[PDB]
Each structure stands twice: as structure tokens, then as C-alpha cells.
Amino acid sequence: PIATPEVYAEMLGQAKQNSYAFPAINCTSSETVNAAIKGFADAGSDGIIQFSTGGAEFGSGLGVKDMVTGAVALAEFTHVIAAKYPVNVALHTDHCPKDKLDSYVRPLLAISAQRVSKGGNPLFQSHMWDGSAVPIDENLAIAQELLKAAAAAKIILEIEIGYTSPEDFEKTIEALGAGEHGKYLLAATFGNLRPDILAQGQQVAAAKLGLPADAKPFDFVFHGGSGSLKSEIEEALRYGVVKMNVDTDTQYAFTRPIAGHMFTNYDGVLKVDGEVGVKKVYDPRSYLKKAEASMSQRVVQACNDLHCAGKSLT
Amino acid sequence: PIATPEVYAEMLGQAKQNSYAFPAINCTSSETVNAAIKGFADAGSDGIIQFSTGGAEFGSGLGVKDMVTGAVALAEFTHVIAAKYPVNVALHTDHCPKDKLDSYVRPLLAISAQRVSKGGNPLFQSHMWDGSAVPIDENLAIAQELLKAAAAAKIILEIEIGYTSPEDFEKTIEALGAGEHGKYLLAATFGNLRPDILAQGQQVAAAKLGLPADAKPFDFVFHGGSGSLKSEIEEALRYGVVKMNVDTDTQYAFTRPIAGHMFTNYDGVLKVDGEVGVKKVYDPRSYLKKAEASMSQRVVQACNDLHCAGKSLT
Ligand code: NA
Ligand code: NA
């Protein structure tokens, strides 16, 4: 099943507490969605699927080029497929800069807010506001009003600040609270390395809130997950990193067999020397199955790398 | 938008009255569904997308392998997307044999039956029963109960009988009627070529019903529509072919640009000689946009060849 807001939060809670993180796979089609979910399930693990603005535009198709239709289209498809797997999958929307709030995140927020007022769950379980490229102040201002929308729509907001400053973590707590006005995830800039910036950010916020020095007020997000060194990732997990984006590596694992298929069956996927090709290899499923299954093998590898393998709530 | 049953019958009606037919494009994923619809709207045509048992199993993913899940999932996807287009798009399932009636055709009829008792429309507008491999007597007995169920979900039923003899057309009329028991499409055997077999079935049929000689009681479908001849097609259209399945040709169009992309961008989709590849060209979207546009062009061609281009009812 797709994750309800309650299991999503339980998912993030249980990961924060036992120091593992969820892989969040960017997907741009039913094939790749299917590969990610199959990967998670295979690693007896819950997981997260995300739609980037680019990937959602691609999803609405070349004749539509509309992120919101793209996202909703894909999510609807994902709801039907999720139901047939035992693990829980959270739908998330990825990097959305300021100039795209009115045509991506705000529209989607209104869609879920509408579903929630009818007594249903929201379409997506989290959305990212990316204000990394504007003054931390202006970022937190906007973050504030999006957080009220998100929380109303039972959705977790993710935000990105800015090496991030100790004063930045303070400003963030001041502005957003630490969950009482809506749960939210934090992506800080620590060399994406310097994972100890995150450890520092956690004490700093604990001091300010008046909690024990071991308390972890933030749930962190790790951008720059692909191509990474186990040691650094292990350390980051201890400091409360709960979600790690994997995009580039699941792309290569997905394309690599297609490439292979094309070369080895060159004179069968192409009509060469007056011949008519071999239909069993230019059938998209012949290589798209290889692609999907290759992406599921990589996705499994990530659930082992973030130790969420085998830890599915269900 | 998706064709309601009313518009769907209105489409086929007009196509019969004016001797054109619609391409019915086989689809297996979100990319192919977007290509097909974009093709129709470029061609200014209404159109048909259909999911075979094999592609619908492919749509549910390597980790579910279930026809019904894949048909529903891909169908909810198409409902969202078709809403953005001004042409009517009907959803059809393809070739379903006796031993797959229970795991494909019937549970889908059930889903739409429930949907229609609540005030709305069926999920699909037409469903195929392929009994070509059983004796016409048994073929038609099963057709009769399916047609009861199909007409109750406001659904058009397609059937295949078996060269089809004058006697088989008479039987078919005797068992199903000519519309008073709900509407159905007929695929007959005639070398798929001898399109004159179809004219014969129209005469035979028209005579049994005391309708005009030149009547056209049957709505015929044309399987084996790829690698066909542009004069075979014209004749068939005169005799009431309203729907021609294209699969092989749109498959090759999809795969062709993917293959070329891999070969030309070889040292970018592979990591070769210590290099790390180019992310711009092993990003799945890069070459699936090509594939999708190529497939759309083939669809515009089929629309042109079948004379449904520019004849959308909206
Ligand atoms: Na069928
Ligand atoms: Na068919």
C-alpha cells in the first residue's frame, strides 16, 4: 500500500530512532515506478518514490507538458500498483524552486487538501520547497506559509537551507518550530562532506528548545546520495539522516541493459540488409524488462546501504 | 477526454457511415500511452488504446505479474492524461482466450459494473473475447453471456469468429442479434487477404435481417493490420471495418530511435575507458522522448491511412 500520513511519520520516526534511512528513487514512468517498488519489496523494506519537476513534465507526455498532470497521472498509477505490495511506499515531489511553486507544489497541495476535506488521504505524502538559492530569511518566510498548507493537507514538507551555519539551524527552529506546527524534513548544506555539521545542528537546536543534548529535533535529508562512501553515510545516519535521494545511479542501472540489448541484437532491432528485423527483440518489453529488473537490483543495493532493508513496518 | 460509452458508439457509428476506421494502438506503459494519445490529437482524430493480456501483465510490473492490476493502473493513468486532450479516446483490452476470461475480462467487467451502478461510466469502453480457437458454436455461446454482462456495464464487446463462411456470419447474427442485445464488434477470418469475405458477411447478414442488400449490419475489426497494403485497406473500409489493430509497426517506431541513440551516444550510456559516462544521455527521459515522438508519428500515419484524421467528434 501507499503510505498514509500516519505510517509515513511512523516510518520516519522508526528510522530516526534506529539510525537507518530510506532510499528515495526518482521515477519518470510506470516502468521505473514498478522497478522501484519491486526493489523495495524485494529488500523487505518500505521506501519512497519521488517525482522531479522534470520527471513529472515527462509524465504528462510530450503533448501535454504539464507538471501537475504528470504528477497526478503517475501517482494515480502508483496507488493501484502499491496496493498489491506488502511494503509501504510514500509519494514525494522533488526539487521545486520558487518560480515553480504556483505551477507545481501549490496546485498539488490544493489537490490533496481537497481530498483531505472529503475524509480521504492526500495524493502525495511529502513535497519539497527548495529555497536553497535565496536568503535563508526569505526561504523561511515562504517555508512558513507552505508548512501551514502542508500540515492542513496532512503532508510533510521538505525544505533546504543554504556549510550551513549554527545560526541558520536556530533561525529555522525559530521560524518553523520543531514539529508542533507541522512535521518537516531538513536538507542542510554540508558539502553535498562534513556530516558533523548535522550533528552540530542537532545539539544547537536541542539547546535552544531546552532538551537533552542527545535529542534529535530535526529529521535530515541527504542530497548527493549516489556515488557515496559508506563511512560518510554511516556517520550521517547516526546524526538523524532519514531520507537519501538516489537518482543518477538508478538511471545508469536502468539504461545499461537497454544499451546492451541494442548492441548484441543490433541486426534484429534494426532492419538491416533488406531483412525485416526480429520482432521478439524490438518489442519494447524485451529490453524494458531487463531495464526494470536492473533498476530493482540497484534499488535493493541502496536499501542495504542505508540499512532500511528488512525493516518494513508491515 | 476518455470516450464515454455514448461518444464511443457515436464514433464507431460515424466511422461506419463514412467509411473510415480508427487505429487501435497496443500500449504497455505510460510512455506508449502518451505517444498514442499525442498521435491522435496531432492527427485531429479520435482514437483507441488497447492493452493486451501480455502488456497489461507488463504494466503491473515484474513484481506483481497480474493482468487486472496492470490494466486498471494503466487505465487510471490514461484517465488523468486524456482529460487534457480535446479528442475522445476509448480504452479497449485485446485478445482474451477462454482460460484467461476469469483472470482478465470478467473481473474487469465487474469493476466497470460496480462503477456504473454508482452513476458514472465504465473504466473501459470495449473488451475482446478471442474464441477463434474454439468451434463457432461454443465460441458464440460464451459470447452470449459475456454480451449480457458487457451491455450492462455500458461496454462494447469484440469477438473473433475463426476463411469465415457465409454460414458463420448467419450463426453470429442468430446468436448475438444485430444490436438489440447490446452492441458488439466482429473480427472475422479472411486471410489476415480476401476483403470480399467481409462484403459477403454484410450481404448474408443484411439478408437474414431483411435489411437493404447494401446494409452493413456488422461492425468489423481488422487484425494483422501492420505490414498491410494500402489498397487492401481501402476495400476493407468499404465493407465496414471500423477498427484496425496496429502493434508491430508502432513497436518498431518506438524502439528505432532508442537504438540509434544508444549507438551514437555509445560512450555516454556506457562508462568506457575509465570515464563515468554522460548523465544527459543515459538519463532514461533523453531517449524515451525520442521513442515516444517516433511512435506518435507512426500513429499520425495510421490515422491518415485509415481516413479518421481530422474527423474527431469534438
Ligand atoms: Na481482452
Ligand atoms: Na482487439
Measured CA distances, B230 to B18, B224, B236 (Å): 18, 13, 10
Classify strands A22-26 and B89-94 as parallel, antiparallel or unpaired: unpaired
Q: Per DSSP, what are the bridge partners of residue B187?
A: B160
Which class for A166: exposed (0-12), middle (13-18), buried (19 or more C-beta within 10 A)? middle
DSSP string, chain B: -BPPHHHHHHHHHHHHHTT--EEEEE--SHHHHHHHHHHHHHTT--EEEEEEHHHHHHHT-TTT--HHHHHHHHHHHHHHHHTTSSS-EEEEEE---GGGIIIIIHHHHHHHHHHHHTTS--S-SEEEEE-TTS-HHHHHHHHHHHHHHHHHTT-EEEEEE----HHHHHHHHHHH-SSBTB-EEEEE-S----THHHHHHHHHHHHHTT--TT-----EEESS-SS--TTHHHHHHHTTEEEEEE-HHHHHHHHHHHHHHHHHTHHHHS--TT----HHHHSHHHHHHHHHHHHHHHHHHHHHHHT-TT----
Look at A69 and B79 and tell me if their CB atoms are within 8 Å. Answer: no
C-alpha radius of gyration, chain B, whole number: 20
Place of cell 487505429: B23
CB of B24 closer than 8 Å to CB of B245: yes
Contact in structure between A306 and A262 (CB atoms under 8 Å):
no
C-alpha distance across the termini of chain B, in Å = 10
d(CA B207, CA A214): 89
- How far is B230 from B251, CA to CA, in rounded Å? 20
Q: Between A251, A284, A289, which is nearest B254 by CB?
A: A284
* C-beta atoms of B258 and A258 within 8 A: yes
Handedness of CA A234, A86, B285, A96 (dihedral sign): negative
For residues A101 and A136, is the Cβ–Cβ distance under 8 A?
no
Nearest by Cα to B186 from B229, B140, B150: B140
Report how far residue A136's alpha carbon sits from residue A134's, in angstroms, rounded to the nearest whole number.
Answer: 6
Q: Do B270 and A277 touch (CB under 8 A)?
A: no
| CATH class, A1-314 region | alpha beta
Pick A73's closest partner by Cβ from B80, B259, B292: B80
Kindly list the protein residues that place their beta carbon closer than 5 angstroms to ligand 2, a single-atom ion. B 94, 128
A–B: how many Cβ contacts below 8 A? 176
Please give the distance of CA B312 from its chain centroid, rounded to a whole number. 17
- The residues of A carrying an active-site annotation are 94
Tell how far the Cα of A94 is from the centroid of ligand 2, in angstroms.
39
Q: How far is the CA of B67 from the centre of ligand 1 (A)?
A: 10
Cell (9 digits) for B137: 458454436
B78 annotated among ligand-binding-site residues? no
Q: How far does residue A69's CA lie from ligand 2's centre (Å)?
A: 28
Q: How many CB atoms lie within 10 A of CB A313?
A: 13
First to last CA, chain A: 10
Look at chain A and count its residues.
314
> Three cell numbers at A228?
557515496
**Using CA atoms, how far apart are residues A34 and B63, in angstroms rounded to an integer?**
8
HEC letters along chain A: CECCHHHHHHHHHHHHHHCCCEEEEECCCHHHHHHHHHHHHHCCCCEEEEECHHHHHHHCCCCCCCHHHHHHHHHHHHHHHHCCCCCCEEEEECCCCHHHHHHHHHHHHHHHHHHHHCCCCCCCCEEEECCCCCCHHHHHHHHHHHHHHHHHCCCEEEEECCCCCHHHHHHHHHHHCCCCCCCEEEECCCCCCCCHHHHHHHHHHHHHHCCCCCCCCCEEEECCCCCCCHHHHHHHHHCCEEEEEECHHHHHHHHHHHHHHHHHCHHHHCCCCCCCCCHHHHCHHHHHHHHHHHHHHHHHHHHHHCCCCCCCCC
The rounded distance, in Å, linking the Cα atoms of A108 and A123 is 8
